[PDB]
């Protein structure tokens, strides 16, 4: 679910950017409060999350093509479907009669995604699902062949759907290069709450500002709140304002006409103690982008597990219980401590 | 302090009560307790919502898990007292009973309409059942429920919620199990479209302000907050309760010297909106009761060394 | 994609309000802030949800694999 | 009025366009203009007054 930005460059309309929503209008508070939001870490409201905020999906398409081995227009060894030998039967939980998976099926690592009968083996075999992240079957396409019919099914495309609810460690950013890593999904009864009775969707820490000087975010905060109040799109094209006509004055006047504080502050109360905080806190509406994972994040742990034949040392792996490397630098550190048993 | 001293001084004022929202003040109560009620109302007052969705088919453009999610956000008009809690240690067969669970079904196929007024944009006349609404969740009573819920069918509190859209040939087919839960677990169970409070504003003037200053001063606060008295011509506070605490006064130099802005620290203006299942007052009562049981359940637990 | 059911911050149901909001802008020829008020969206929390919704689904729906174009 | 360009949400214009994709030409010429060096240069392989 994307939203149009309340604070917009007019060119956003001219390039038809609403056809590809890229973010959403969050209620953002610039507050030190949770204690988990230092070092550019940020907070997402737990209830906001549970109500759909920032939810997203990933799709992966895999091609299963059992003509991969055959030497060019060769006799066909392997056909999608089941043989009449004896094979598991649990297989039919994932797979339809054709040997293709039923659409919609939940599929986790090791499950069948494909069944064919191999002639050279006189057995019915099975391509298995490999990701450590479970998914659902979206589309299964039968890619038939040309060169005039006669040929039976040899190529299939399976598209997996992977759920991405926002997690700890997911990255978020306003449109001002203020990128943050989700530190907590903070329970809404535990968030600060406004005189207006609102809890922030996102917390960004005031200490994230004096080194970066993204003063444009502060402007967006006022403009976005004023836009949400008056039902107004706000033009944020560069160079339309100047020193004799500042946006803080302009949007501030708009907030005052609405009935809120002219500087964009709002009174808030601690979710924990219940009491009014020391000063009014800076709150408003800022368009936020959720950043895709670029990294194979997933953790790993090994007690024991597979070792390599030559050295009898832990194999490299994760997906196969590989060990973690203590390399030369960590060796030197262990010597530097004088800790010979840790080294041993 | 003393519980009787509290009883004599505590006071409630009910500004507006309605089937959906309440506005009321708790006076001379400590912030720790007002806060408790507030937290409890949001996160610990049980409600009924769809929890498990069983799909048999969905060839719409909206993905299963997403559709399931929205159904879970639909506020069901069900009295939570009419249900007992599920024990989540039993297998699925034993888990769901007529005291445990409410079953909703949904069954739509979209077909093309022949009788469409040629050159039409509206999908109501172009397609049959293009739009799927919460009201389309049919309540299927199980066992004793045919009797128990005969006097109050299960209906979403907001019938016209848009749930899904379809085009010719696409169908949705699902059953949902709806059970007791609390907001702290997942926000779909929260019975409020929000309960919060504000402290009663205190605008105290540090010397008389009259004449053209009075008119000026008066306009720094919303209409009705500041009054100008006839006679002394001086300004006075009518009702702070209408003030939004914009601190606008503090901008104009002439006044920043003559006004302090504070709060009456123990006077809470509560606003409670119900998501639709129970009335506000019920939700607030239930919270005041919930707090008391915490204290009671604890007083009766043995303290293990 | 489709109207959200509840406002992300308020919790307030908002999903019953999309089709009417369009009819307000269209038929009654109101501005956006007047129409939002008429639907009961008071907090800027909630006004934001309907004001800035993009009914992207109506685009997705034009690709229907189950009918002869 | 007759002014400089202020911002609009274009709510009705947008949603109708989603439902009724134009039958004549795209509503965002600027977007086609941005890709012009690619389409143009490829087209140059076969057009021109000289084959």
């Amino acid at each position: 679910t994307g939203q149009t930005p309340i604070v917009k460059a007019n060119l956003y309309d001219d390039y038809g950017m609403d056809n590809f929503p890229n973010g959403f209008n969050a209620v953002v508070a610039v507050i030190s409060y949770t204690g988990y939001d230092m070092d550019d870490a940020m907070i997402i409201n737990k209830s906001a999350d549970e109500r759909g905020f920032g939810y997203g999906t990933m799709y992966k398409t895999e091609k299963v093509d059992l003509a991969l081995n055959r030497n060019r227009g060769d006799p066909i060894t392997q056909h999608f479907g089941f043989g009449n030998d004896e094979w598991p039967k649990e297989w039919l939980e994932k797979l339809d009669e054709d040997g293709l998976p039923y659409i919609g099926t939940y599929v986790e690592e090791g499950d069948p995604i494909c069944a064919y009968f191999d002639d050279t083996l006189n057995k019915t075999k099975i391509k298995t699902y490999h990701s450590s992240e479970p998914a659902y079957i979206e589309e299964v396409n039968l890619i038939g062949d040309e060169s005039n019919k006669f040929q039976e099914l040899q190529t299939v495309s399976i598209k997996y759907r992977i759920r991405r609810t926002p997690q700890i460690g997911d990255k978020f950013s306003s449109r001002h290069g203020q990128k943050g890593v989700c530190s907590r999904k903070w329970p809404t009864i535990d968030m600060p709450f406004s005189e207006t009775g609102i809890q922030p969707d996102i917390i960004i820490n005031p200490h994230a500002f004096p080194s970066r000087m993204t003063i444009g975010m502060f402007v967006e905060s006022l403009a976005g709140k004023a836009g949400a109040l008056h039902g107004i799109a706000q033009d944020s094209t560069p160079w339309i304002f100047n020193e004799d006509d500042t946006p803080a004055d302009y949007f501030g006047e708009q907030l005052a006409k609405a009935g809120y504080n002219y500087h964009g502050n709002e009174p808030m109360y601690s979710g924990a103690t219940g009491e009014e905080l020391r000063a009014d806190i800076y709150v408003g509406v800022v368009y936020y982008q959720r950043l895709r994972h670029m990294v194979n994040d997933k953790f790993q742990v090994r007690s024991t597990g597979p070792v390599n034949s030559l050295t009898m040392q832990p194999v490299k792996g994760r997906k196969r219980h590989g060990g973690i490397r203590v390399g030369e630098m960590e060796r030197d550190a262990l010597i530097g401590h004088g800790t010979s048993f840790l080294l041993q | 302090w003393n519980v009787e001293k509290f009883k004599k001084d505590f006071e409630v004022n009910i500004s507006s009560l309605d089937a959906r929202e309440a506005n009321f003040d708790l006076i001379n109560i400590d912030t720790s307790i007002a806060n408790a009620f507030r937290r409890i109302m949001i996160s610990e007052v049980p409600s009924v919502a769809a929890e498990y969705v069983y799909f048999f088919n969905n060839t719409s453009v909206i993905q299963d898990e997403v559709l399931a999610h929205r159904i879970g956000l639909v506020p069901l008009k069900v009295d939570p007292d009419m249900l007992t809690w599920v024990d989540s240690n039993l297998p699925d067969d034993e888990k769901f009973t007529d005291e445990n669970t409410i079953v909703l079904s949904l069954n739509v196929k979209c077909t093309r309409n022949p009788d469409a007024p040629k050159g039409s944009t509206d999908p109501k006349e172009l397609y049959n059942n293009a739009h799927v609404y919460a009201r389309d969740l049919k309540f299927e009573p199980q066992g004793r429920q045919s009797t128990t819920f005969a006097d109050c069918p299960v209906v979403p509190a907001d019938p016209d919620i848009l749930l899904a859209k379809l085009r010719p040939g696409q169908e949705i087919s699902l059953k949902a199990h709806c059970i007791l839960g609390i907001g702290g677990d997942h926000a779909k169970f929260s019975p409020v479209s929000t309960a919060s409070y504000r402290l009663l504003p205190q605008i105290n003037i540090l010397q008389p302000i009259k004449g053209e200053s009075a008119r000026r001063f008066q306009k720094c606060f919303p209409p009705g907050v500041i009054g100008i008295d006839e006679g002394s011509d001086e300004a006075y506070v009518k009702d702070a309760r209408k003030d939004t605490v914009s601190r606008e006064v503090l901008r104009y130099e002439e006044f920043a010297d003559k006004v302090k802005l504070g709060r009456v620290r123990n006077h809470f203006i509560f606003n409670v909106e119900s998501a639709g299942a129970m009335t506000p007052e019920e939700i607030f009562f239930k919270s005041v009761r919930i707090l008391k049981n915490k204290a009671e359940y604890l007083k009766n637990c043995p303290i293990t060394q | 994609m489709i109207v959200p059911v509840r406002c992300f911050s308020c919790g307030k149901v908002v999903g019953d309000k999309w089709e009417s909001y369009l009819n307000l802008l269209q038929e009654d020829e109101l501005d956006e802030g007047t129409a939002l008020s008429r639907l009961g969206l008071k907090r800027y929390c909630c006004r934001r949800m309907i004001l800035t919704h993009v009914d992207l689904i109506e685009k997705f729906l034009r690709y229907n694999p189950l009918e002869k174009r | 009025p007759g002014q400089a360009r202020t911002a609009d949400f274009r709510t009705l214009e947008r949603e109708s366009r989603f439902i009724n994709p134009p039958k004549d030409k795209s509503a965002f010429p600027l977007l086609q203009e941005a890709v012009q060096p690619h389409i143009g240069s490829f087209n140059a392989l076969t057009e021109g007054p000289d084959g």
Binding site: G197, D235, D244, K257, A258 | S15, P222, K242 | S37 | -
Partner: peptide, 24 residues
Amino acid sequence: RKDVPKVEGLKLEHFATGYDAEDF
């Protein structure tokens, strides 16, 4: 240079809880 145009006809769109537009 012309200033960025003021939007005409802006009214209160916020009230303390328990009040509404026509209480003003």
